[PDB]
Amino acid sequence: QDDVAPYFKTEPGLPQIHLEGNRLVLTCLAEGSWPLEFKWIRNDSELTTYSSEYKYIIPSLQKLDAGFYRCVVRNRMGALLQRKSEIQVAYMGNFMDTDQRKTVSQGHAALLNLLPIVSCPQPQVTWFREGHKIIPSSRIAITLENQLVILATTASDAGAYYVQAVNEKNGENKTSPFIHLSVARDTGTHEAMAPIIVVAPGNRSVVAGSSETTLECIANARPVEELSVHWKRNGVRLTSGLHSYGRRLTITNPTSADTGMYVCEATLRGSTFEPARARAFLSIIEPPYFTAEPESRILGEVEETMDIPCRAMGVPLPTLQWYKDAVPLSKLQNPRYKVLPSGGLHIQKLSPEDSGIFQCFASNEGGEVQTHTYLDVTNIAPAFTQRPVDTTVTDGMTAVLRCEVSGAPKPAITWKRGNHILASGSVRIPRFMLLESGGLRIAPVFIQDAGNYTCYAANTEASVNASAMLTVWNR
Amino acid sequence: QDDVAPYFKTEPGLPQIHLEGNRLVLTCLAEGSWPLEFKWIRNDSELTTYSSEYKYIIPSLQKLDAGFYRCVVRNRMGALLQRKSEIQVAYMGNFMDTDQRKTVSQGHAALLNLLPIVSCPQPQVTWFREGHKIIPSSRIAITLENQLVILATTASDAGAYYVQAVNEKNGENKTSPFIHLSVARDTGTHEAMAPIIVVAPGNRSVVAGSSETTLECIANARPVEELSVHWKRNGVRLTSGLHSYGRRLTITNPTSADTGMYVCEATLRGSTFEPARARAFLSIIEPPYFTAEPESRILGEVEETMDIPCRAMGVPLPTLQWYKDAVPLSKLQNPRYKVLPSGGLHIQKLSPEDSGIFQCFASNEGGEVQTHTYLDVTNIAPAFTQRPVDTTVTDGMTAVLRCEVSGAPKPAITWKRGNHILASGSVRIPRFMLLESGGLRIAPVFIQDAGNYTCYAANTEASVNASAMLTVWNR
Ligand SMILES: *[C@@H]1O[C@H](CO)[C@@H](O[C@@H]2O[C@H](CO)[C@@H](O)[C@H](O)[C@H]2NC(C)=O)[C@H](O)[C@H]1NC(C)=O
Ligand SMILES: *[C@@H]1O[C@H](CO)[C@@H](O[C@@H]2O[C@H](CO)[C@@H](O)[C@H](O)[C@H]2NC(C)=O)[C@H](O)[C@H]1NC(C)=O
Ligand SMILES: *[C@@H]1O[C@H](CO[C@@H]2O[C@@H](C)[C@@H](O)[C@@H](O)[C@@H]2O)[C@@H](O)[C@H](O)[C@H]1NC(C)=O
Ligand SMILES: *[C@@H]1O[C@H](CO[C@@H]2O[C@@H](C)[C@@H](O)[C@@H](O)[C@@H]2O)[C@@H](O)[C@H](O)[C@H]1NC(C)=O
Ligand SMILES: *[C@@H]1O[C@H](CO)[C@@H](O)[C@H](O)[C@H]1NC(C)=O
Ligand SMILES: *[C@@H]1O[C@H](CO)[C@@H](O)[C@H](O)[C@H]1NC(C)=O
Ligand SMILES: *[C@@H]1O[C@H](CO)[C@@H](O)[C@H](O)[C@H]1NC(C)=O
Ligand SMILES: *[C@@H]1O[C@H](CO)[C@@H](O)[C@H](O)[C@H]1NC(C)=O
Ligand SMILES: *[C@@H]1O[C@H](CO)[C@@H](O)[C@H](O)[C@H]1NC(C)=O
């Protein structure tokens, strides 16, 4: 054909991470009636101008190039916007070069946080004390946030700790300065410490279909030998998916049946102490999907009212965003564009400048989907659905001549007899000659009203005339 | 820190396509008792030897360097094999440099296949005829396989066609040679043509969780205006997800409820011709998951029988392969290693050589998963559960001296009185002096049997002796 609006051949894939210093080539593959132009956008900011270059090449990736990219295609018809593509860049910074200090009273839990370091993705850490690798045991844990946890600390736990971090994507590794941990011997060598949850499980929301999800719970008590950390769901202790001395519970292939509350509980076996409990909540995000899409192309008559359907579902409920030619309707500030609460678009009076691509985006916390349509608004020249015919009407009785025309917008109809005008939209005021929808009615009719009449229906595009002779018979 | 078998901190992620000439960094991030060593494998072939370097770096990635990579971690305890990672390289070759010719009779469908070109991934195409971009219409379609299909060809459709292919990953573009198409005018301009399916929909198997899938169906008829191609499933025409003049049916978020058969049908609206039909079948692959995993560490006594659980479900049913220290049990040809049909491992008699990591892999047509355990086979020194006690027994009656021990392997028990050995595993013959399991029974007992007795239990590790006095009373 010779009048095709743009449409994409292929949409962006899943987000991806790339190494610093590598070459990146984004492509914008769309088809449509020429001349096609492409503009590139990063983070809702225009990067390039429109050109015949559908590619975008970064010869050496930096960390600042990371973000969300998307392409815009445009020809004479309209503009279409590509879905987001998430380009991440792998980097790892350096530790602040200064030692730190921390003090813990004897028996309490010692929690050493990973010293600040910017890294993408999260680095894998290996903790060290006096040159010896610290491997987790019943008394030592390494939380998911790379924090070291020493349970039931004694005087022998004092010393200088440090960590060695490795970024699993670029292989870079950095060694931190020291954290000097000191233990105060005030609590005593012999006592009993009620179980206390040091690291509680947190609420989690998982996109439906993910491989696995993990929960953690660290607790402190003394004697640590008798400390038991267990997971309850639906009032029953769980046994499957447990890791790291019962401190980690993993849901493999989580589904809607796994949502709800999980309860971490720590008890000191054989003690009169009340247990420690912490609640966590698993929910699942359903990425959006359309239940109502508009047809690909939509024809419209001017001055008409248009409704473009767009409804989408998801968990949580998706949000709809309307664009016209890659411009959000919000910034267009067109008062005639009203967005229905269902999500559909409502256009009051169609004007020729409303032609172009309309786009609907459904967004969740875990997805985004797009639909679009081409709106074609054209003018219709006036035409006669039924022309007036010659008629004979008895004196004193009413007479009606029909002159029905179709046009966009509605043609202005003017009934005139020879050189004088009898009725119009502006003028329907003399001798009870009435203009009704589609025609003229004279009531009553004298012989002085006899003669031939002409109906002039005019539009912004053209004008048309229809003649018909009326003869008045004697009473 | 000693006594900790290896285990990975992170496993490889989903496959990604990389550009030619980019830097590639694979990491083998595992923790465990030092000294740790690492080896690298590509396609069942070692790349590196064992060393203290956990990284593998390709400064300039080439097409030939594509393949499957994995690392093996090893310390004094055993060896552990990482999940394979798929390294794909984006490339785009050229077309075979020669023109081709094709002929179609006026009214038939003309199917032009994309000329041969090797490219990863599959290139997007734009079709041209005499320097004009061919845009799909009701009469012209571009298949999912980049084929151009012209329905109801006329003499005005003859000419030289060519395609321009673009690789969406690296942006390269190549232009094919010419297909000189001629249209024979034998059948005639004035006639009707029955709907005939040209491009049939293909069977599709899709891994569960994929975004979308699409069947295509292209049919030819004349007049092409009256040709309607629609999709029926379960005897009902589908209205959701129709694309490109009804020729494309797209299942969005395909789940188990979407599997089965789909039927394409093409009719000439208002004709006495029978409709044309074509069946297609959609199935869904469920990646493997474990339903039974072994414990992280398993302690075992020598000469005993061991069973290691490994079950895994999925669609299709997964295949399970076993390894011992990164060596497949099939290659080991060990007769004491029997693989259960449920997937479990069965070890007949535990020998100290059986110590080390065992690793179960579950793989299907759409995934692979890993579980492992460390088997520690040790010897247990003999220890008395109950030593012999002083006893007084009436002459003629039976008597029992109890000497029960625990050890691995089973301690050989030798019952001796003074310098003479009354009973042993080798000798249990004399005077109905019988060796009960863990004890000595004299039946009957004469006055000559009085005195104190000693029990000698010995394994390969050590030997222990225990004595007790026996006094016989007169009848
Ligand atoms: C473009 O937007 C992305 C996403 O909002 C930004 O990426 C974030 O960067 C900040 C700091 O650099 C991090 O704390 C976030 O974790 C990143 N991701 C997200 C999802 O927020 C990126 O920085 C933006 N680029 C520019 C130039 O503003
Ligand atoms: C490693 O093996 C893989 C497959 O076992 C090879 O990749 C295949 O190569 C053949 C022919 O070169 C292609 O037809 C397949 O499409 C490839 N499959 C892929 C890429 O998944 C690979 O070439 C081997 N490695 C090396 C270095 O040759
Ligand atoms: C954790 O969530 C509780 C309930 O909130 C809802 O349910 C869980 C599954 C979450 O997914 C959350 O997004 C939902 O809104 C709250 O009662 C509780 O306060 C939350 N805890 C927090 C926010 O720290
Ligand atoms: C299409 O498939 C039919 C059924 O086979 C099953 O479904 C397909 C989708 C595959 O997943 C296959 O592994 C399954 O066994 C076949 O009976 C039929 O012959 C196939 N037809 C063609 C043209 O391949
Ligand atoms: C990275 O690891 C190596 C291996 O031990 C080590 O020698 C080197 O010091 C580490 N780099 C840093 C910056 O600590
Ligand atoms: C209407 O009047 C104009 C002007 O006289 C004339 O050109 C036109 O032909 C008339 N319409 C028809 C249908 O004849
Ligand atoms: C094809 O590639 C050439 C150079 O590689 C480039 O100049 C041109 O713009 C590309 N596109 C077309 C349509 O030729
Ligand atoms: C065992 O018997 C011998 C001789 O019959 C005797 O000398 C010895 O004291 C006895 N053992 C004990 C522990 O009395
Ligand atoms: C008997 O046991 C003792 C004590 O365990 C040990 O010293 C001795 O070597 C054993 N054997 C003999 C023959 O005394």
Residues B431 and B442: their CA atoms lie apart, in Å, by 8
CB A407 within 8 A of CB A391: no
What secondary structure letter does DSSP report for A51? B
Residue A381 phi/psi, 5-degree rounding, is -70, 150
Q: Do B373 and B385 sit in the same domain of this protein?
A: no
Please, which residues bridge with residue A140 across strands?
A: A150
Contact check, Cβ <8 Å, A168/B135: no
What secondary structure letter does DSSP report for A446? -
B337 CB-near residues (< 8 Å, 6+ apart): B322, B324, B329, B345, B346, B347
Report the SS3 class of residue A124: strand
Burial category of A428 from C-beta neighbours within 10 Å (exposed 0-12, middle 13-18, buried 19 and up): middle
- Tokens standing for residue A307: 């409704």
Residue for token pair 């813990």: A104
Contact check, Cβ <8 Å, A168/B33: no
Residues A281 and A160: their CA atoms lie apart, in Å, by 37
Q: How much distance in Å is there from the Cα of A350 to the middle of ligand 9?
A: 110
Contact check, Cβ <8 Å, A23/B22: yes
Q: Do B371 and B398 sit in the same domain of this protein?
A: no
A463 lines ligand 3 (CB under 6 A): no
Q: Do B321 and B292 sit in the same domain of this protein?
A: yes
Atom of ligand 5 nearest to the CA of B52: 4
Distances (CA, A) of A298 to A46, A235, A291, A308, B311: 29, 57, 19, 9, 56
Contact check, Cβ <8 Å, B16/A21: no
Q: What is the dihedral of CA B99, B100, B101, B102, to 10 degrees?
A: -140
CA atoms within 13 A on the CB side of A205: 8
Residues B198 and B112: their CA atoms lie apart, in Å, by 12
Report the SS3 class of residue A215: strand
Nearest by CB: B289 against A22, A169, A253:
A253
CB B127 within 8 A of CB B134: yes
* Three state DSSP letters for chain B: CCCCCCEECCCCCCCEEEECCCCEEEECCEECCCCCEEEEEECCCECCCCECCCEEEECCCCCCCCEEEEEEEECCCCEEECCCEEEEEEEEEEECCCCEEEEEECCCCEEECCCCEEEECCCEEEEEECCEECCCCCCEEECCCCCEEECCCCHHHCEEEEEEEECCCCCCEEECCCEEEEEECCCCCCCCEEEEEEECCCCEEEECCCCEEEEECEEEEECHHHEEEEEEECCEECCCCEECCCCEEEEECCCHHHCEEEEEEEEECCCCCCCEEEEEEEEEEEEEEEEECCCCEEEEECCCCEEECCEEEEECCCEEEEEECCCEHHHHCCCCEEECCCCCEEECCCCHHHCEEEEEEEEECCEEEEEEEEEEEECEEEEEEECCCCEEEECCCCEEEECEEEEECCCEEEEEECCEEEECCCCCCHHHEEEECCEEEECCCCHHHCEEEEEEEECCCCEEEEEEEEEEECC
- Residue B62 one-letter amino acid: Q
Ligand 8 binding pocket mutation candidate from B448, B469, B470 (most atoms within 8 A of CB) = B469
Domain assignment of residue B308, given as a range: 287-378
B214 CB-near residues (< 8 Å, 6+ apart): B144, B243, B248, B249, B250, B251
H or E stretch at A330: helix A329-332
CB A202 within 8 A of CB A279: no
Residue for token pair 């949409």: A11
Residue A305 at interface with chain B, using a CB cutoff of 8 Å: no
Neighbours of B31 (CB within 10 A): 18
Ligand nearest to the CA of A162: 5
Largest CA distance in chain A: 131
Residues A21 and A36: their CA atoms lie apart, in Å, by 31
Contact check, Cβ <8 Å, B135/A169: no
Ligand nearest to the CA of A175: 5
Instruction: Indicate the length of chain B as a whole number.
Output: 475
Q: In Å, what resolution does this model reach?
A: 3.5
Residues B148 and B395: their CA atoms lie apart, in Å, by 109
Please, which residues bridge with residue A454 across strands?
A: A416, A467
Residues A168 and A120: their CA atoms lie apart, in Å, by 9
Q: Do A371 and A415 sit in the same domain of this protein?
A: no
Q: How much distance in Å is there from the Cα of A153 to the middle of ligand 5?
A: 29
Beta strands in A13-144, from DSSP E residues, in sequence order: 16-19, 24-27, 30-31, 37-42, 45-46, 55-58, 67-74, 79-81, 85-92, 100-105, 110-112, 119-120, 124-129, 132-133, 140-142
Contact check, Cβ <8 Å, A29/B166: yes
From chain B, the residues in CB contact with A240 under 8 A are none
Report the sign of the C-alpha dihedral through residues A385, A390, A394, A397, in that order. Answer: positive
H or E stretch at A23: none
- Residue B297 one-letter amino acid: R
Angle CA(B88)–CA(B90)–CA(B92) in degrees, nearest 5? 140
Q: Is B329 left (phi over 0), alpha (psi -120 to 50) or beta?
A: alpha
Residues A311 and A339: their CA atoms lie apart, in Å, by 12
Q: Do A349 and A412 sit in the same domain of this protein?
A: no
Distances (CA, A) of A212 to A16, A207, A403, B80, B255: 19, 10, 73, 22, 19
Residues B374 and B79: their CA atoms lie apart, in Å, by 10
Q: Do A402 and A319 sit in the same domain of this protein?
A: no
What secondary structure letter does DSSP report for A329? H
Q: Supply the CATH number for residue A405's domain.
A: 2.60.40.10
Distances (CA, A) of B343 to A44, B109, B310: 53, 54, 5
Angle CA(B8)–CA(B12)–CA(B15) in degrees, nearest 5? 170
- Measured by CA distance, the residue closest to atom 3 of ligand 3 is A281
Contact check, Cβ <8 Å, B126/A252: no
Q: Do B361 and B394 sit in the same domain of this protein?
A: no
Closest residue in B to A20 (Cα–Cα):
B23
Please give the radius of gyration of chain B, using alpha carbons only, rounded to the nearest integer. Answer: 39
A46 CB-near residues (< 8 Å, 6+ apart): A39, A40
Ligand nearest to the CA of B390: 8
CB pairs under 8 A between A and B: 72
Q: How much distance in Å is there from the Cα of A323 to the middle of ligand 5?
A: 52
Report the SS3 class of residue A212: strand
Q: Do B367 and B397 sit in the same domain of this protein?
A: no
H or E stretch at A248: strand A248-252
Nearest by CB: B1 against A31, A135, A253:
A135
What secondary structure letter does DSSP report for A59? S
Contact check, Cβ <8 Å, B168/A16: no
- Tokens standing for residue B426: 């080798």
Please, which residues bridge with residue A315 across strands?
A: A286
From chain A, the residues in CB contact with B208 under 8 A are 209
Please give the radius of gyration of chain A, using alpha carbons only, rounded to the nearest integer. Answer: 39
CA B172 to mean position of chain CA atoms: 35
A43 lines ligand 1 (CB under 6 A): yes
Report the sign of the C-alpha dihedral through residues A319, A322, A325, A329, in that order. Answer: negative
Q: What is the β-pairing status of strands A391-394 and A463-473?
A: parallel
Please, which residues bridge with residue A356 across strands?
A: A375
Ligand 5 binding pocket mutation candidate from A172, A175, A176 (most atoms within 8 A of CB) = A175
Closest of A394, A415, A417, A393 to residue A404, by C-alpha: A415
Residue B55 at interface with chain A, using a CB cutoff of 8 Å: yes
Q: How much distance in Å is there from the Cα of B173 to the middle of ligand 7?
A: 6
Residues A241 and A282: their CA atoms lie apart, in Å, by 15
Q: What is the β-pairing status of strands B248-252 and B212-216?
A: antiparallel
Interruption sites in chain A after residues (C→N beyond 2.5 Å): none
Shortest CA gap A408–chain B (Å): 28
Q: Do B366 and B303 sit in the same domain of this protein?
A: yes
Q: Do A389 and A406 sit in the same domain of this protein?
A: yes
Residues B422 and B431: their CA atoms lie apart, in Å, by 9
Largest CA distance in chain B: 132
B238 CB-near residues (< 8 Å, 6+ apart): B230, B231, B232, B249
Nearest by CB: B16 against A16, A34, A289:
A16
Q: What is the β-pairing status of strands B391-394 and B212-216?
A: unpaired
Burial category of B440 from C-beta neighbours within 10 Å (exposed 0-12, middle 13-18, buried 19 and up): buried
Residue B137 at interface with chain A, using a CB cutoff of 8 Å: yes
Residues B210 and B213: their CA atoms lie apart, in Å, by 8
Q: Do A11 and A71 sit in the same domain of this protein?
A: yes
Residue A144 at interface with chain B, using a CB cutoff of 8 Å: no
Residues B133 and B28: their CA atoms lie apart, in Å, by 50
Report the SS3 class of residue A283: strand
What secondary structure letter does DSSP report for A410? P
CB B406 within 8 A of CB B329: no
- Residue A154 one-letter amino acid: T
Q: Do A370 and A402 sit in the same domain of this protein?
A: no
Shortest CA gap B27–chain A (Å): 6
Residue A27 at interface with chain B, using a CB cutoff of 8 Å: yes
Shortest CA gap A65–chain B (Å): 17
What secondary structure letter does DSSP report for A116? P
Nearest by CB: B135 against A33, A134, A171:
A33
H or E stretch at A332: helix A329-332
Report the sign of the C-alpha dihedral through residues B266, B269, B270, B271, in that order. Answer: negative
Residue A256 at interface with chain B, using a CB cutoff of 8 Å: no
